Amino acid sequence: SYAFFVQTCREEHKKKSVNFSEFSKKCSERWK
DNA sequence: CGGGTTTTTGTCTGGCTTCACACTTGATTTGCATCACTGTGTAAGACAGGCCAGATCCAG
């Protein structure tokens, strides 16, 4: 379940995918 | 009988290696079965039997 919501958010903010470094601090304000 | 606080880990995430993987055929190299033999078995003791010797007995 920890990956489903992340994949949905990835589709979300990717429909608007090679930058994993600047994505580190994105999930901090999502699961909270 | 189960609340705190670090360990112990598989991932999420997508993008970079170094090895993995279809075909030949003619060798070339290993692996394994087969066959006629080998050594270690290895010195004394028990018992019957013929043979004289000498003791055991016989009779004038």
Q: A7: which nucleotide lies closest, measuring CA to C1'?
A: B12
Q: What's the Å distance between residue A17 CA and nucleotide B23 C1'?
A: 39
Q: What's the Å distance between residue A4 CA and nucleotide B28 C1'?
A: 57
Q: What's the Å distance between residue A26 CA and nucleotide B44 C1'?
A: 104
Q: Are A10 and A30 in contact (CB under 8 A)?
A: no
Q: Are A30 and A9 in contact (CB under 8 A)?
A: yes
Rounded Cα distance, A14 and A27, in Å: 14
**Residues 6 or more apart whose Cβ sits within 8 Å of residue A30:** A5, A9
Using H for helix, E for strand and C for coil, what is the string for chain A? CCCHHHHHHHHHCCCCCCCCCCCHHHHHHCCC
**Residues 6 or more apart whose Cβ sits within 8 Å of residue A17:** A10
